Every structure is written in C-alpha cells, then in structure tokens.
Amino acid sequence: GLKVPKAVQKELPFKSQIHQMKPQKKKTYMAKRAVVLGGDEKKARSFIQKVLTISKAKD
Amino acid sequence: VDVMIIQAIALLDDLDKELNTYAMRCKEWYGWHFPELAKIVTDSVAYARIILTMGIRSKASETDLSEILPEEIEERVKTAAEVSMGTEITQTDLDNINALAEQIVEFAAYREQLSNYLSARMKAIAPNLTQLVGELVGARLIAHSGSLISLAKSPASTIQILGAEKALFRALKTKHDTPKYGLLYHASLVGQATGKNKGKIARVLAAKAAVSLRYDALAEDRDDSGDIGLESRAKVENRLSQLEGRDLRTT
Amino acid sequence: NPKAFPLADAALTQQILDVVQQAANLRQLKKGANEATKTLNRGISEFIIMAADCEPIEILLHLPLLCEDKNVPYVFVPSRVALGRACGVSRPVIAASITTNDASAIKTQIYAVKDKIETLL
Amino acid sequence: DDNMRREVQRDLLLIKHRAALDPKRHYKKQRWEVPERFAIGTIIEDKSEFYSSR
Amino acid sequence: GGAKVVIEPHRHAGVYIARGKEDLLVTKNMAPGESVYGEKRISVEEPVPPTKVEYRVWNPFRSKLAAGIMGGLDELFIAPGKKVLYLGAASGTSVSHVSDVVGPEGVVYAVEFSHRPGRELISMAKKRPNIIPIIEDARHPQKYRMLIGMVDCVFADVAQPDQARIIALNSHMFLKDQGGVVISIKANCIDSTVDAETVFAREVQKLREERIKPLEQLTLEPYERDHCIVVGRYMRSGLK
Amino acid sequence: PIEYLLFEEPTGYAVFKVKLQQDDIGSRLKEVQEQINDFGAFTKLIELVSFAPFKGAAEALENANDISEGLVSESLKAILDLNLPKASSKKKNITLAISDKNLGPSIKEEFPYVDCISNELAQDLIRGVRLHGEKLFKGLQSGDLERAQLGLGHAYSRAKVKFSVQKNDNHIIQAIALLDQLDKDINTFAMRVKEWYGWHFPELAKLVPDNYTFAKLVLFIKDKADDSLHDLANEDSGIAQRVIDNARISSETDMENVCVFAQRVASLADYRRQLYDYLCEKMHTVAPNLSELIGEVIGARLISHAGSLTNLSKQAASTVQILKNKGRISRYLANKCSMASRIDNYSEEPSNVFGSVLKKQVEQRLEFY
RNA sequence: GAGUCCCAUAACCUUUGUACCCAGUGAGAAA
RNA sequence: GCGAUGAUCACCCAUGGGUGGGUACAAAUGGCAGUCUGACAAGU
Secondary structure, rough: OOOOHHHHHHHOOOOOOOOOOOOOOOOOOHHHHHOOOOHHHHHHHHHHHHHHHHHHEEE | OOHHHHHHHHHHHHHHHHHHHHHHHHHHHHHOOOOOHHHHHHHHHHHHHHHHHOHHHHHHHHOOOOOOOOOOHHHHHHHHHHHOOOOOOHHHHHHHHHHHHHHHHHHHHHHHHHHHHHHHHHHOHHHHHHOOOHHHHHHHHHHHHOHHHHOOOOHHHHHHOOOOOOHHHHHHHOOOOOOOOOHHOOHHHHHHOOOOHHHHHHHHHHHHHHHHHHHHHHOOOOOHHHHHHHHHHHHHHHHHHHHHOOOOOOO | OOOOEEOHHHHHHHHHHHHHHHHHHHEEEEEEHHHHHHHHOOOOOOOOEEEEOOOOOOHHHHHHHHHHEEEEEEEEEOOOOHHHHHHHHOOOOOOEEOOOOOOOHHHHHHHHHHHHHHHHH | HHHHHHOOOOHHHHHHHHOOHHHHOOOOOOOOOOOOOOOEEEEEEOOOOOOOOO | OOOOEEEEEOOOOEEEEOOOOOOEEEEOHHHHHHOOOOOOOOEEEOOOOOOOEEEEEOOOHHHHHHHHHHHHOOOOOOOOOEEEEEEEEOOOHHHHHHHHHOOOOOOOEEEEEEOOOHHHHHHHHHHHHOOEEEEOOOOHHHHOOOOOOOOOOOOOOOOOOOHHHHHHHHHHEEEEEEEEEEEEEHHHEEEEEEEHHHHHHHHHHHHOOOOOEEEEEEEOOOOOOOEEEEEEEEEOOOOO | OOEEEEEEEEEEEEEEEEEEOOOOOOOOOHHHHHOOHHHHHHOEEEEEEEEEEEHHHHHHHHHHHHHOOOOOHHHHHHHHEEEEEEEEOOOOOOOEEEOOOOOHHHHHHHOOEEEEEOOHHHHHHHHHHHHHHHHHHOOOOOOHHHHHHHHHHHHHHHHHHHHOOOOOOEEEEEEEHHHHHHHHHHHHHHHHHHHOOOOOOOOOHHHOOHHHHHHHHHOOOOEEEEEEEOOOOOOOHHHHHHHHOOOOOOHHHHHHHOOOOOOHHHHHHHHHHHHHHHHHHHHHHHHHHHEEEHHHHHHHHHHHHHOOHHHHHHHHHHOOOOOOOHHHHHHHHHHHHHHHHHHHOOOOOOOHHHHHHHHHHHHHHHHOO
C-alpha cells in the first residue's frame, strides 16, 4: 500500500488529513464481555459468509 | 388438595378453544341463509341465541327481540333481513342449525359453571391469592408451577416472571434485558397501572403474592376468609395510588 | 336444450370421425373419458368429442365444464359405437380428444374441424 | 420492527444473493434492496395432491 | 411445498410478490382457509394475538390477467377499491383473483352465460361476498342493466368474434368516463384466416371506433401463443 | 323532443321529466359529452317527477325478470298511467325515453299514445341518471341502492340458474367437517370424565369402555347403588354391582361438577348421531349414487376431501383417493365411484339406479376374485 | 432497574412401543 | 361365455428363514431446561 511518510502527513491540511487508526493492544471490557453463539449459529455464520463471497466474486 | 385446579384450568383453555371452532362452523353454516348476521353481530352465544329465537328472515321480519342484541343492532339486522344475498333454508337443515345453536349455548353454560367451580375450589384452597391476584390468574400460577407448595417455596421474583420463561431465558443466555410481567400481567392491579409502573407494581404484586401464597400453603390455623390477602391487597392498592399520583411533567 | 346439447348432424359427424381416425393413426388421439379429462387439465387438447348416447350421460357431461373453463371446443357425436370404430379400437369409446401437435401432418384438417364445431358452438 | 428484522435478516440476505446459490439457476438482473413493508410466510401445499411438491 | 417466502408489495396496488428461489405472483385471500381451483397458498402470521392471514398464488398459465401482470403492464385499472365488470367469467378461476385484488370495499360483477359455470360462480360468491354473479348474455346488456350500476373497469375475457361490440355495449352502459377497459384478445378465436397482428390491429381500430383509447398492448407470449391484452381507457370525448 | 324518461332500478321505477333537451347535432362534442359527467349541469336537463318503490324483493325479482325479457309489468303500467299525459295515438304522441329497444314495443302495446326512444341521446340521458343515481332522487327511497343491487343480482342469478339449496353439497361438507371435530371433542371430554371418575372406582372404564355408555351410567350412579335392574342399559351390570360392593377408590361439590361434565358429554353424544342421521339423509338426497356405491359416511368424506361434489365429479378417475387383487379393487372402485359421482352431480334430481348398477358391477368384480 | 400479552397455556428432537412402505401409465388380457 | 363405461405395470440363502430401516403416532425428570436485580425512591 501507499506508505505516506510521517513528516509529510503531520504537515498536511485539515481536509487532507489521513485517518489512520492504531491497533488495539488492551483487552477491553466490551470485547471481553461480548458473547458469540456457537454450533448452529457459527455454521450459519460460516454459511452466510460463503454465500456472500461467492456472490461478490461472481459479480 | 388442588390436583384438580390444574385439571379445571386445562379444561378451561381446551373448552374455550372448542367453543371457537363450533361457533365458526355455526356462523358459516347459517351464513348460507343469512350472511350479514355473522358480520353485524360477532358474539358466538348471541349468534346462537338469535338463530334459536328467529330462525328465518321473514320470521325475523315478524318477530322482535331485546334480551339479545341490545337496542341498536336491531335496525341493522332488520335491514339486512329485508335485503340480503342469502338464500332460503329448509326445515330439515334448520333443525340441525338449531341443534348446533342450542349445543353451543349449553357449551357456554357449562363454561361459566366450570368457572364457578374453579372460583370455588380456588377460594377454598388458596384464598389469599384469590383476594390479591384473582381466581383464574392464581389458578394458572398454581397450575404452572405444579403444586401449591412448589409455588410457595419460590421467591417473589420467580412469581413475577413466572409465565415468561422463553423470553427470560433467551434474554439471559444472550445478555439482554429480561421481561418484567410474565403470567402476572393479567392481574387487575397491573391493569390499573399504566406506563413503567406496571413493571413496578408487577414487582410489588409478586412480592405480596409470594407473602399471601406461602401463607396459604404453609398455614395450619388458616380460616379461608381472605384476611392476609386483603391486607396485602390494601398495601398494593395504596402503593399503586402513590405511584399513580406522581407525574413526570413539571407543573 | 338437452344435456348433450351441441350435437353434430351427419356431414359434420363424418368429417369429425374421419379426422378422428387419422389422428388415431398419427398417435394424436387420446381416447376414453378419463384420458380425455387428463389431457384437458394438462392443456394438450385441440377439441374433445363426446358421444351423446352412452348409458348414463353425465358420465361424460363432466367434460363440457372443463372445456368451458379452458376454452376448448367440444362436440357431441351421436354414436359411441361409430366413435370407437373411428378411434380404431375394438370397443366403443364415449369420449376422445385431439392432442395438440405442430409436427402433425393433419393440422389443416384438425383446424378446419375446429372451426366448424366452433361456429356450431 | 428491527427486532424482527434481526430475526429474518439472514434469509433476506439469501434472497438478495439468490444468484449464487445454485450454479444452474441464473436469475434476471435486479438489485432487490430490502423492502420497507414485507411479511414472511409459509407455503401451504394443500391436502389434494401428494408426493410431488410435498 | 412447505418452504418459506417473503411477501412484498408489487407496483400494482393490491397484488404482491412472494420471493423465494422462484418468485410467485400472489394476492391476498378474501376467503381464508380454502383454495378455489387448487392453487397453492401462503399463510403469514401478521400481528389480541397475531392472526393467520393467507395469500393465493396467481397462476399465469391459467389466467390471462396474471400473464399480463407478470409480463408487465404499465397500468391495470383493477385496483383495491374499485368496481370491475368481468365479462366472460368462465369459472371462478380469475374472478377470484380479481375479487380479492379489488378487496372487501370494491365490487366485481361476474357476467357468465353458461349455467354450470354459473352454479360454481354462485357457490364461490358465497364465500367471496364482493362478487355479484350475473348469469346473462353479455351481448344484451339491457337484460341485466338493472343489476349493475357504474363500474370503474371492464375486463373482457370473452372469446367470441363479436367481442368489440360486446365490450362497446357494456362500456357504454356501465363504464364511467376515463375508466379502464382491459381486453384479452385471442386471435384464433376471433378469426384464423388472417395473422395475429392483423386481428390485433383490427380490434384496436374497432375499440377506437367505439371511442376507447388504447394505451398499451402486451402480447403475453411465454404463457399463451397468439394472445394479447389491450389496456385502454374509456375516453368518451376526444381521443384526440 | 325526449319529453319523459323511464329509469328502472332495483328499488323501483322512476319517471323523470326532461327539462332541457341536449343537443342532437352536437351530441358527440366534448362539452356535450362531459355535461353528463358534471352534476351541476345534468340537473339542468333532468328532473324527477315520480318514483314508485317496490313492495319488496319478491316484486323486485318479478320486475327484474320482466324488465330483463322486455315486458311491461303491472307496476310499470301503474306508474306510466299515473305520469304520462293522455296524448293522441295519431298525432304527436308523448315521447318516453327508455334504454331498451325491445321494451319499447311492450310499452306501445299498452299505451298506444306513447312513442318510445332509445337511441344515443336517450342512452346518454339514461347513463347520466345512472352515473348520478342517489343524488337525483332527493332522498326519497328506502334502502341503499347498491345494497338492493347486491340482493337483486344474487336473486336474479339463482333464479336464472335454478339454484336449489336441497342439492347443496356445502351442507354435507360442513356436516362432516363438524362431525370430525365433535368426534375428537366427545373423545377428549369423556377421557377426562373417565379420569375424574377413576378415583371413585377404576373399573367402570374396564367393564364399560364405550364413552357414551360409561357417561350415561355414571350420570345416575353416584354411590353404592344393589337394585341392579335399571343399569343394564346383565352380566356387566352384575359385575359392576359386585365392584360397587368391592369399592376400591375414594366429594360432593367435585362430584356434582363431574356430573355436569358427564351431562355435557351425553349432550355431545346425542347431538352426534343426530348429525350423523342428518348427513346420511342429506347424502341420500344430494349424492344417492355415491352413497349406494360406498356408503354415506364414506361418500361424505370423499366429497369433503375433494372439496365439492363438482370437484369430485370433474376430477379424473385415476386421481381419486378412496379409503394385487386388494390393490386393484381400489382402482376399480375408484373409477366406478368417479363415474357415480359424475352421474350424481350433473343429473339434476338424481335417482339411485345407477349407483345400484355400479354396486352390482363392483360386487361382481370382487366376487370374481 | 429490567424484551412476555407475539402461543413454557408453546415449539422441536431422541431411548422405547403402534400401522404401512422402499400413484401415474395407456391396450391389452385369456388360451 | 374380457376391455377406453379402462387391460396392464435398501443386503444373503437351496413357498419359507436370515440383513437396513423409515414414515405416522403414545410415553419421555436421557433431553432442549436454566426460573430476573437487590436498597433506595418520592416530596418540601
């Protein structure tokens, strides 16, 4: 990808600012809280993902 | 003993179901002769009583009635009797129409006398629950939890949410908000409340109903007179008064 | 008006029976009452011939209602024996049907008989 | 409501991406965004004919 | 056969599409709980508890009007509050679908001349109260001019060569100004000596000679060979 | 000159008096063609002078048939003789505008001083008063005109087709569809009666297993008794009195309640078999050939599952669901039964003789095997 | 504080017991 | 002493035994299945 240098991108205009968000290093509470369902729900998730990527690649 | 409270309330549900499926076929069988009746009066027993009263449309033109169909649907049934897209039936099937109509009239008579029996057994088995939440509501509480002692040894939060188990356990097994009404939503006090305070008095009604219910199941010198249920109901009524008196508007 | 109403006279009857025989040779004829009502509700039928003298008559009067529903010409031949003999089978038939085909070598004859029985009907 | 759209939200995706469910079906090109008012219904095959669509 | 579809409103008011993996033209059911000619049904549970209301699949190979709808007609005049005069109500096949598209607040006058179809029409009009069955010949509208007043659309599924005269007589008696005239023309039943485009052009010319301005025609070809629906409006003054 | 106008309608007859003539030569023009749509200008043409309403739906159907086949009825004679002036028959007749060119001759046959006009001017005057309707009449009729139209259309159609409600198979559809419902209702209700009496002694449901007989005998036994003479409707009655002597199970209000429940079961039990006798009779008058061939209850369920007598008739014979040699007698009985239902539906007032012949044919076929 | 009136008054499955079974076709059948 | 008013039509053994099941139902405390929170709130 295009790696614009920090010396350039700190001195950019307000409209031309590059929104680059840092990765998260802390196991935050909402992520350690939030529940995912399993079994039939995870195979439903797998199925919907396979269907959607087959549709997008066909298009 | 209350092994037949469960039986009476299951018969009540089953029997109201069979009343509806008899009334539908009576309405669409007599609808060949007089079709506007089932749409201008919708009550099953008023429909059966009126076809037992008149029978035929010209017979309706010569007769009148006031003990059924009160005072304002008479001109509508007379106008629909004068002009109608309905045929004319014979006597050999008017006889079966009349037999079905008296059948479902006697069915509703049996329904209301079974409700009298349920009210009698309920106010002789757990009368403080009848004085607080009512006969058939307490009856399906007892019939839900099995035994009266098995309902009595349950906390008041369970008695609050007692009917709404599938909503409760889906809202616990994903981290959502639990229901607040359950089977106790059809109590008359929760009917009197309006807003979020019907959740509030579902809570206070379940608390006082737990008090009265385990008094009824665990007392030995109980008198079948409604005293503990009546003082608990007075507590719930003045609490309902004091949270219907407040208003979130600013005056 | 009888029940078996749109009966054909003798010239139309022999025109009908000749094209019935030719369609039976060309495998374009479904013969018999329930085969006729099968091909009628399937829609492969160009006209139905009922015979107006079988031993009940409502036994095939069930078919004019079906033809009316699907707009198919129907005509009454006055001999079940001659209708079966034209069909080419060794029994009397009471109803027969000319199925539709466009690789058919008698399409002009079938269309002419259809026009004649439709101006009758 | 959104409470019911969060229950039928997956088969609406299946109907939106019909075209890549079977490799032999090949629908005609529409877009089919989710309609504002819909209803989910079940086909009653009656008690007249058996064994074919049953 | 036991599958699940999503019901969606069509462009045309009163008719719907059930999307599955094959999508169905669908109408609401005015008499819920039975099928009229063996079509399949869809039962939705719409939200006192929710009520099971149901829907009927409109079969384009057994209905010229459904063949027209799903071939694509820019304007049907059969609408959910209207009055339709169905001419040639040959059974209750399409009249039931027109009836429950028109709805409980609108009226369908189903004119038929044969008598066993009339018996089935009356037994269907029992459970569909918005159908007035009229057993009479449409070639003489005066014989039933007393039973019908001021329709909004005429639909003509008659299959007779004097079609345009029947349509013109019934329109001049009972249709109102700028009302709908939907015609199902069958070329082979009008006449088979000329081709289909000649007979459609002649029938459209007959309609504008009887002052019904044609808006639209559709051949409805995958379902019927050599048919047509001509949609016009009864202009009554100034086709120009 | 189009001086008077006669509008027939389901509520009665109306005679209007034409105030202003519309244009004859400019009758196809745009303004003349839409002045009959505008009501504010149509009331400049037409004024109501008389409206004779009908005596009811009977006279409405009589006059609908007379207007349909082009005859002057007696109410027509009355209103025309009241309203139209006694003009000459040889010089300047009074001109009545009708909509029916073969009702005109019947009007001049009765009033020779009346010439009748139904050409395009009278046609669009007539459709003007049809287009406006209730507004012209100034409030003087009883009954909404469209409601009378629904009633008169249904009456006219059933008259024209000779719709009989005796041979009406919807009665036997609803009779057997209700009879199955009350089969399962008498079953579950007497099952609960046997359950509630099971702790009074659990042997009456062992000796007397039939629901009605159990319920009627327990409606009068409520105790011990001894005196076992009127409990035989006696080996089972003697065994029952022996079991009442050796009673081996356990009120008053609950026992009164289950007496009311068993009385309910008895009432359902004799409304059933009233309904069954009714539908055997209705099946003999509606489908005699089917009931001769396979019986009344079987033919009832056959035309119920088919949906109508007409649907069972128009069904193919190879697609009838009746209820080796045992495998093909079903097919023989199916196509003979389809034949019998066709006979029975499309004959107008059927006999029994072809059901008899088909019964003879199928018994010959089964006795051949 | 808090999703029942939207069928826990309900829905569905598996260890055992109860009854069948692996419509169309369209000219043959018998000797 | 025929008939279109309808003829016809999941594994081993030298009639019969041995090898899979399913559907349509009855139980069913194996099941799914597990009965929310807990100290403030209203007013002057």
